[PDB]
């Protein structure tokens, strides 16, 4: 045989990106997974080169980042590609998960592939939280104060988890030094989960936008989907370059250019845009212990979808009622992000409580009821009785 199939290390390359059989009818939504692999390489490589110039002491952390912007050769390119690249990583990941909801990719036999992806999403959220602390701006200090104080409401162990997380009595110098060391490590755990994610995908292959079997017409990966992947790689890099060079502070907050002061509270404490819907869910529960449980339940409720979908058809292509309620769920997610950036005022308090209910009722009430009705309408529209 050829050397790409007989060698021990090249046969893994050949069976994944060269000779792997793809369904002939997948569209451009199936290109988001390879863009996420490019984003992870960009975040790791710009991370190492900035870490050669960074100091994690609380007296030196803010001035180290200003030293990178002013004194390091091409240092402003390294930071702006890193900060804007984190926002592009979350946008591609949101579209990748929404493709899986629409086409039914979570269903059997791909449940293990969907469960490993939910773990990856949790680790990415924790990574971006720890890197934002390392700036030690004014939004960095008070955002870490709000989130770490949530864990003291846990019964019997709460007041000792928080001081074990602080290394002291508040957010201080041991907190920033341990948060930078954890920030180095978790992207390497993410890279190992991506390898386990690709092993489960190799077993069954990909789905297709019609929802039915792809075993009857396959084309190989090399020179068809390699060149289709190049179209979205160059479009991604062009839009990212327009943000890095021409508008580099649009997706950030101007309060993060003030150094962290534990005696002055800002007028508004706002997270980054990709964490705003989970911030509005937390502020809609008045009790403090039930608010942090509901905040973590908003991620873990993705695991109930293989059991609450009752349809005998995979995907949303031929279902008009499931199409309508999918886009109700999408614009509800955008509204929750907008409520999370407002003040706690009338009428945004009641609007956030209704939108929180609609988020959880989609997974647990709407999907099993609508998919049961669509099973029966397909039957009685054909059977003569």
């Amino acid at each position: 045989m050829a050397f790409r199939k007989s060698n021990v290390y090249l046969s893994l390359v050949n069976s994944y990106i060269i000779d792997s059989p793809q369904p002939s009818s997948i569209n451009y939504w199936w290109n988001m997974g390879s863009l996420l692999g490019l984003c992870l390489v960009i975040q790791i490589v710009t991370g190492i080169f900035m870490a050669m110039h960074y100091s994690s002491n609380i007296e030196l952390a803010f001035s180290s980042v200003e030293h990178i912007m002013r004194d390091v050769h091409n240092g402003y390119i390294l930071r702006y590609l890193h900060a804007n690249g984190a926002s592009f990583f979350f946008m591609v990941m949101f579209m990748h998960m929404a493709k899986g909801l629409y086409y039914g990719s979570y269903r059997s036999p791909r449940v293990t592939l969907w469960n490993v992806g939910v773990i990856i999403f949790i680790l990415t959220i924790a990574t971006a939280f720890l890197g934002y602390c390392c700036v030690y701006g004014q939004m960095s200090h008070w955002g870490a104060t709000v989130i770490t104080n949530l864990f003291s409401a846990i019964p019997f162990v709460g007041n000792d988890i928080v001081s074990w997380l602080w290394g002291g009595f508040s957010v201080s110098n041991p907190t920033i030094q341990r948060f930078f060391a954890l920030h180095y490590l978790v992207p390497f755990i993410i890279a190992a989960m991506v390898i386990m994610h690709l092993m489960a995908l190799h077993i069954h292959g990909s789905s297709n936008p019609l929802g039915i079997t792809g075993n009857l017409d396959r084309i190989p990966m090399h020179s068809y989907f390699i060149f289709k992947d190049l179209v979205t790689v160059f479009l991604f890099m062009l839009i990212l370059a327009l943000f890095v060079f021409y508008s580099p502070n649009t997706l950030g907050h101007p309060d993060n250019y003030i150094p962290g002061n534990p005696l002055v509270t800002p007028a508004s404490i706002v997270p980054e845009w990709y964490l705003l819907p989970f911030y509005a869910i937390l502020r809609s529960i008045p009790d403090k212990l039930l608010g942090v449980i509901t905040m973590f339940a908003a991620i873990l409720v993705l695991l109930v979808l293989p059991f609450t979908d009752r349809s005998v058809v995979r995907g949303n292509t031929f279902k008009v009622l499931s199409k309508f309620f999918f886009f109700i769920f999408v614009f509800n997610f955008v509204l929750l992000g907008q409520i999370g950036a407002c003040h706690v005022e009338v009428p945004y308090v009641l609007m956030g409580q209704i939108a929180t209910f609609i988020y959880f009722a989609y997974f647990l009430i709407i999907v099993p009821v609508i998919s049961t009705i669509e099973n029966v309408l397909f039957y009685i529209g054909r059977v003569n009785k």
Binding site: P21, I203, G205, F331, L335
Partner: protein, 93 residues
């Protein structure tokens, strides 16, 4: 190594679908075809029906949520002005 478990996809030659009989296919080399014959007859009629047979599943949920956000933003603006001062003490109870 040991043999694996039972899956629903194979490889080239044993892919795992039904048996095929009676289907013929034809194709022409890309080197013998006309170069780039799409922007027209695809932006004429094809790239309008592909979304405007689908536009009503997107814009009815978009119009519901845009009407709800715009109505709540004008009510918050009224409550913190001079004319909406008396209603503001009533609804913060």
């Amino acid at each position: 190594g040991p043999p694996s478990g039972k899956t629903y996809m194979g490889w080239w030659g044993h892919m795992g679908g039904p048996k095929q009989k009676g289907i013929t296919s034809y194709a022409v080399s890309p080197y013998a075809q006309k170069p780039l014959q799409g922007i027209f007859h695809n932006a004429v009629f094809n790239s309008f029906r592909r979304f405007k047979s689908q536009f009503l599943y997107v814009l009815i949920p978009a119009g519901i949520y845009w009407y709800w956000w715009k109505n709540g933003n004008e009510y918050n603006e009224f409550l913190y002005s001079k004319a909406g001062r008396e209603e503001l003490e009533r609804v913060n109870v």
